[PDB]
Design a protein around this ligand. Structure first.
Ligand SMILES: O=c1ccn([C@@H]2O[C@H](COP(=O)(O)OP(=O)(O)O[C@H]3O[C@H](CO)[C@@H](O)[C@H](O)[C@H]3F)[C@@H](O)[C@H]2O)c(=O)[nH]1
Ligand SMILES: [Mn+2]
Length: 542
């Protein structure tokens, strides 16, 4: 299904005025798009983009020309053509399953989740990416946070007891102690990393922990070697041995999250894009599970008292109550069911004997070389599940989004950091520079990355979404769909992206492990944590 012909547009866009130079260029660009000999998707997309740009040139210079009605209609057809190109030359994505666990020992629970994908898709090659030099990053982060927690409680000992105490005062003061301790580590790291002994990240962390956190070198080394052994025995593949990092800029971004911030989710955000770029296939967070067979429970009616998400959780709890594929999976929600419902679940679940009659196989996941598919959550894309052919056009758009976003971040953040001010004063310098570059186009992005330094340590610090996370994907989707580049303002949402959705029957997101985030926490979690901190420090309560 092609575009209108040049001759058709001449009739539709007819004017009594002579043909402007900009219009003759549209007509040539349209004609050449229509006469393309190639079947290369990227070639067709780029010619389509050239055409679209040439239409915008005309329409912005002659905002009154009568031609704009037919040109506007052509623009709408061009958008549809993008989808037609995308849904062409499709073939099965490379049969790789990519997982990422960086910063410490991969947990048994994570391996149980991975096992479900392995059991069901034996033909897929499983790659569990890790960083061979960085098994002590999580240990360091926990040591920093726990020491800072104590310093903050001591400092606020008289005030934390108040029933009127805003626990945010604890989190702000603890963040000051966290930031100083991170600086202490980073400066030590900088003093070691260029030595001719060429120490590793873990060499440096271990020395820092031994001398500054009263840790035992041999215990840390045992944890390090056991983490390496465990992951290598469970599909482990080292990012540092597979040329994922093909340029210094991407290594620097990965490193600033791994080392300076201790944000392993952000580090994982970078690795998964490079793995899909270089190998193609499916990326999944370790808390994702296979999709349930489309009709396994169609016969069971969800009661009106249970929401849609809670019902999806219940289906999984039911499967696990009766098949125990995953050791001790929660039944918190399934156990509250009316008995007739529990018995209906048991009947269906136990009627099936093969795991692949409960869960869906991936089989062939047909995609084109232009696209990436993504899961949705709460109205937005969420990059916890991805599908992409190697070298795909859209995956490269996301990578450029990420690089541009960190370029802007670091331009304003690096001067603030290099001032060696405390957390509060560093934040001010960062913010003052950041917001002096504000425009209508970038103001939302700026506000979302302003609390960057707090991510992982204070409630609702979510800058990662707009740097390496969903926000970079959503803007890349806007670029692809609208034939733009370097979009920072507009992000496409779930309702815009049905053409790019990770197929719903191939993914169960509402898992027990997904409920909780490992790089962030919300206000209710902050209260729960503060109460526990107060307990453990004073020996009291409340
Ligand atoms: O100690 C650690 C802790 C976490 N990770 C990596 O971070 C990934 C996501 O962590 P997690 O599921 O706990 O946080 P979540 O809030 O759901 O992440 C979203 O936001 C994240 C940030 O954009 C995004 O990565 C994710 O896809 C979203 F769902 C996890 O699957 C690992 O690959 C790690 O390697 N080592
Ligand atoms: Mn998760």
């Amino acid at each position: 299904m092609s575009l209108i012909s040049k001759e058709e547009l001449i009739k539709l866009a007819y004017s009594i005025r002579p043909r402007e130079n900009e219009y003759k260029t549209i007509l040539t660009n349209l004609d050449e798009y229509n006469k393309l000999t190639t079947n290369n998707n990227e070639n067709k997309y780029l010619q389509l983009k050239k055409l679209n740009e040439s239409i915008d040139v005309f329409m912005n210079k002659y905002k009154t020309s009568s031609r704009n009605r037919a040109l506007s209609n052509l623009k709408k057809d061009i958008l549809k053509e993008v989808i037609l190109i995308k849904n062409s030359n499709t073939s099965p994505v490379e049969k790789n399953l990519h997982f990422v666990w960086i910063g410490g020992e991969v947990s048994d629970i994570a391996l149980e989740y991975i096992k479900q994908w392995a059991d069901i898709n034996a033909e897929y090659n499983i790659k569990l990416w890790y960083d061979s030099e960085a098994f002590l990053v999580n240990t360091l982060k926990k040591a920093i946070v726990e020491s800072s927690t104590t310093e903050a409680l001591q400092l606020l000992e008289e005030e934390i007891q108040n029933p009127q105490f805003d626990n945010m005062k604890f989190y702000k003061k603890r963040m000051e102690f966290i930031y100083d301790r991170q600086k202490r580590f980073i400066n030590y790291y900088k003093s070691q990393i260029n030595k001719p002994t060429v120490p590793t990240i873990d060499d440096i962390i271990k020395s820092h922990l031994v001398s500054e956190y009263n840790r035992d070198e041999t215990v840390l080394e045992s944890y390090r070697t056991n983490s390496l052994r465990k992951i290598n025995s469970n599909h482990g593949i080292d990012i540092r041995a597979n040329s994922l990092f093909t340029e210094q800029e991407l290594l620097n971004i990965y490193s600033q999250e791994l080392l300076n911030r201790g944000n392993l989710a952000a580090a994982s955000d970078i690795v998964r894009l490079l793995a899909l770029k270089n190998f193609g296939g499916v990326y999944l967070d370790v808390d994702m599970l296979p999709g349930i067979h489309s009709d396994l429970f169609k016969t069971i009616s969800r009661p009106s008292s249970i929401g849609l998400d809670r019902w999806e959780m219940i289906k999984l709890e039911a499967i696990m109550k009766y098949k125990k594929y995953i050791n001790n999976y929660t039944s918190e929600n399934f156990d509250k069911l009316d008995q007739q419902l529990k018995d209906n679940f048991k009947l269906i679940i136990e009627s099936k004997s093969e795991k692949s009659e409960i869960f869906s196989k991936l089989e062939n996941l047909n995609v084109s070389d232009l696209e990436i598919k993504i899961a949705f959550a709460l109205g937005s894309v969420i990059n916890q599940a991805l599908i992409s052919k190697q070298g795909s056009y859209l995956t490269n758009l996301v990578i450029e989004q990420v690089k541009n976003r960190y370029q802007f971040l670091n331009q304003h953040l690096n001067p603030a950091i290099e001032s060696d001010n405390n957390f509060t004063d560093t934040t001010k310098i960062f913010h003052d520079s950041l917001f002096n570059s504000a425009t209508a186009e970038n103001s939302m992005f700026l506000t979302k990355i302003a609390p960057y330094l707090q991510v992982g340590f204070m409630p609702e610090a979510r800058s990662t979404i707009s740097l390496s996370g969903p926000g970079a994907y959503a803007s890349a989707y806007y670029d692809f769909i609208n034939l733009q580049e370097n979009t920072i303002e507009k992000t496409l949402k779930a309702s815009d992206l049905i053409e790019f959705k990770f197929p719903e029957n191939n993914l169960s997101q509402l898992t027990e492990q997904e409920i909780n985030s490992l790089w962030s926490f919300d206000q209710a979690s902050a209260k729960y944590q503060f109460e526990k901190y107060v307990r453990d420090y004073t020996g009291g309560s409340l």
